[PDB]
Amino acid sequence: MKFRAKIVDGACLNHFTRISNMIAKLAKTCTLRISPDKLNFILCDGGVSMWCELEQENFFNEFQMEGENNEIYLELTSENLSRALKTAQNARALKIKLTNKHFPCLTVSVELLSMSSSSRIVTHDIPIKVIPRKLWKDLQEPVVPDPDVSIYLPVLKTMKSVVEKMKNISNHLVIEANLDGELNLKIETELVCVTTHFKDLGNPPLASESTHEDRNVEHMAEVHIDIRKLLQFLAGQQVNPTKALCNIVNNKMVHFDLLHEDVSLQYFIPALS
Amino acid sequence: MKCLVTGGNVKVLGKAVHSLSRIGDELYLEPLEDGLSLRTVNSSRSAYACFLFAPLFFQQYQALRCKILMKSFLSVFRSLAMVEKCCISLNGRLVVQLHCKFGVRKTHNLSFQDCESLQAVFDPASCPHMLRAPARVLGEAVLPFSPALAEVTLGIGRGRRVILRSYHETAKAMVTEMCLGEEDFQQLQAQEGVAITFCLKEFRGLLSFAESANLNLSIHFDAPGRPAIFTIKDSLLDGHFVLATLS
Amino acid sequence: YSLVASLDNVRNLSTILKAIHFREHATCFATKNGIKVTVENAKCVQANAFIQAGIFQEFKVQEESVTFRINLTVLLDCLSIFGSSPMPGTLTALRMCYQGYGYPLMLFLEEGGVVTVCKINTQEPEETLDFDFCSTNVINKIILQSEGLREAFSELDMTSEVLQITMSPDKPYFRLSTFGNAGSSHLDYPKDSDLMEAFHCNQTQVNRYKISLLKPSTKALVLSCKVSIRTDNRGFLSLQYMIRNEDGQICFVEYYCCPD
Amino acid sequence: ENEPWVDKYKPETQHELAVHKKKIEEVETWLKAQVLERQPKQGGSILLITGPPGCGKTTTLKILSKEHGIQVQEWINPVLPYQSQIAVFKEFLLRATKYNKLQMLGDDLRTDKKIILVEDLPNQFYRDSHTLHEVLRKYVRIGRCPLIFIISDSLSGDNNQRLLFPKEIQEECSISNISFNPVAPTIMMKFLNRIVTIEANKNGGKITVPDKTSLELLCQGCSGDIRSAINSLQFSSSKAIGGKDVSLFLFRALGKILYCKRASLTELDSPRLPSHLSEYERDTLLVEPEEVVEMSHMPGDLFNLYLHQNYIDFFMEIDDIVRASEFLSFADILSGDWNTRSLLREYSTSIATRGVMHSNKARGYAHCQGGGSSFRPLHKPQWFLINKKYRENCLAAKALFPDLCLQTQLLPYLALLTIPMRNQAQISFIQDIGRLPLK
DNA sequence: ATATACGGGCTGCTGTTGACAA
DNA sequence: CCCGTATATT
């Protein structure tokens, strides 16, 4: 097994720093899947499953790897990687390489430049645990069933603020999606009841155009979830993308699709609080 | 004892107090014939920090030795040293009267217990090796390290270069191999492999105080087992730190 | 519908309520002149506010005054549900209706097309004391600024048990003392300063007060621009604040405490 | 005239200690064999010191350390005006184990060997009791100098010592043991006589020396504790005092109840059974069961279980056993609810104790105890393990045939099932219940 | 001929209020 | 509570 990667461009390094910070805030231990074409951030378990897809050719200028089934699975703590990348904000060159100095390690070497002619070299050895092929099927991208309702999402900051203020009253939330772009967040306690409405959300053109003659537009497929995992997902995000979509099903599933720049994010939040 | 500090010296005095608090748990106050001495010692007596203040404010001793809990002083100078004058005396109580803007006056009476005279033994002349460098370079060199580290090793590599590492004693942790160049340091009398291992927190306090006016450090390291010395010289301020090395 | 009230800047009411929030419940008082929310604790300390009819744009009341008891934490959370950090140019509007006795309080909020609806059921009332501090028996009075005591009252939370206040025409004009584990800490304030707008003390007065009762004055001191201190013959302390809003109006908050 | 007699007559030399010579020699040979045979590759070790309060465990260790030139390291809890207490403790431990002092200004300089003494354990160590095991494991892995632990214990109410060191860390960590004993009457007698002689020789004025007859009384009601003896001697010499409470050592209380020390019916005016209760006449008793049970500091429902376990062997007749069993059952009945279980509990223990004591008519005839009572040890109730096994087997039967009655009705069917089925861990359970020994 | 220590058996099986470490 | 045994000392 061999893996070497080179980063020079400042913007790509900054984007990698943002992605690492986001995954560190979202999760503790993560799985990195390296393919000949792309990078995948995986978490599978509270049964939240996390998928992040990243195009390799748009970030690294030099990228070589070797694993027939050329595919690397690694399990590691995200905090170590985030701390390693934090020190390269104003750096010049970054190298990532698989090594076996003492124990299986993912060496990260960063070349710091300064007023001195000599270039400082900072080296970090993040431990890795190679998962055997037997579990390779269990980390696959989660399937997306046919959504009962697909709805465009509102601005993330206002939703995050409303949910954060809602956290104090209770630990239960209900999300309702309409066919006319109406999103309702409801909590009902024995003392206070609160409902927040969103309208004018453009409904994307659904693929099935022959299943809307008997479905009421005013009907809904609302679900109830525990407000402990939604707040993390809204708090992790720092920039509003242009592909904010929510797929809601009646029984036990809510799914989020986001896409920003060239990185895609798939969010899966189980129901039945 | 009567000291009247006026000007920007209050901030540097507070920074020195904060560094001493970061090193020790109790504060020893000693008026010498040449100024004021602040002393602190670790709980296990493996580190000793002393600040000698050259006469700069009003120094006049005798009209003579005390020790105080250090958290009280730390809180007082963290909340009350941001202030144009300071006055220190010894009644009998320790008065820390603090003149402020307009006409506000704040007084602080404290309780002290009798203690012995604390000192150490260091021989900078007897030390063969010697290293000198500006404090900013060393402070930058210790930034990549995590804030949960315990022991750091300083060495001289093959090729006249310095090296700072991370000493660890199957769930291991990260390791660091930060290296520098000889063109930044100003003076090196070293050897071909001599290295020492010491702690980090007292070093961090030293660097924190030394990263204000861009001062220059001075390390006199010896064979393993013998103590190391960190000496800071200024215009009207002297400081010496003694640590211990793993043998 | 008894009383209905509408406004377009929730922040004024929100900050007025937050300036008095240290208990869990509060009592309202709706009258042709405006609302008045009061709170009491330990049967000694009492804090009251005032929101005159000048602020409101749509205010409607029916027949006589209306009284009800409401939870303060829930109401304050509901008011600031759209984030307590708006950029200049964004505002939130609210409408409230109370349809007589035995029915809850409505609250409809709107901002930028987002509409929220909430209800707060009220179980009233309690009884309030008769802390009459009319300016007839007042002997010592002073008026002064806030930036002077920002740090001073910030440097007042220690493990002590009693705060000593002494005011005299001569020598310690206004001295605060705190006796704790370490030692004494005096904070003398003289006259003829930039924060001495009027000094009219008549006779010397030294008194002791409990830290637990007098602690929650920090919130009122932080969101203020002037403070008035009054003490009578017996030794009861009256604190008067002065808060302002973004539009440029003035509202008052009063604190009453009793000596040891 | 500024320190108490406890702090004024402290033993400077070794010969001034009030401890038996063999114990001092044992501690000394352990310490000196560690010092003399200090191998460069020797790792860390832990020593455990136990004993009742006021015997002199700390002073003897300090004196023996000073005699042979050994540095000692104490541990004083820091004073608050964020870091956890355990973090500070581990940092101090690492600093003490790794490095050495610098020079000081006037010390016992020629030192390179030292030990660490920890006495003031933090509260979190008492509440958790699981951080200590990890700390000890890490120290055993990375230890250089030995660690000495000092604990103070009493006869009853020993929860802290067994909670801290529950027989497992000692077994798997190779920890030694040294136990002290209360000071003998002769040693305390001689030392008290020496002290009072020294006070008498001071002269100064005509002061009444305390009488000799009270001097053994002072030592009799202290139970081998020097410090309270000296305090009481100081109090009484101003012109009995020092009634320290006793703990009774529960296994001694059980024997006291079960042995029934009787008298020869000294002539008194105690009521007698008039005409028909002639078979219930008993000799005078010299024990109060209520005080014995209260002083052992144990719950009543546990005392009754221990008595039920241990009362059979001391009986010789069957009818007395029947009566005692009936009394024990009646004592059990009174505590079967939950709301009023703690309102009436003394009745049950009192009834059980008095029934077991009075029913023994064979033993209760004064001069009829000769001869027997061999060297016999007591035991522990066996009901706890059986009840725990019953509960775990309850759960293992329910959740796995959940579609108590299953154990009472379905489990007979299981016992008459004996046929295989599709699993691996369930055949073992089937063979468990259904294979009891039977010829 | 008399005072003192070893040897063997214990941590264990529904509700309403209160303190500690973070 | 219970019985029998090995060491310091006069």
Ligand SMILES: Nc1ncnc2c1ncn2[C@@H]1O[C@H](COP(=O)(O)OP(=O)(O)OP(O)(O)=S)[C@@H](O)[C@H]1O
């Ligand atoms: N002959 C003596 N032997 C022992 N202690 C003596 C003697 N004469 C005087 N003392 C005093 O008694 C003190 C003994 O303290 P103790 O409390 O018995 O020690 P300890 O073993 O730590 O007790 P703990 O910790 O409560 S179990 C010494 O510190 C002296 O001040």
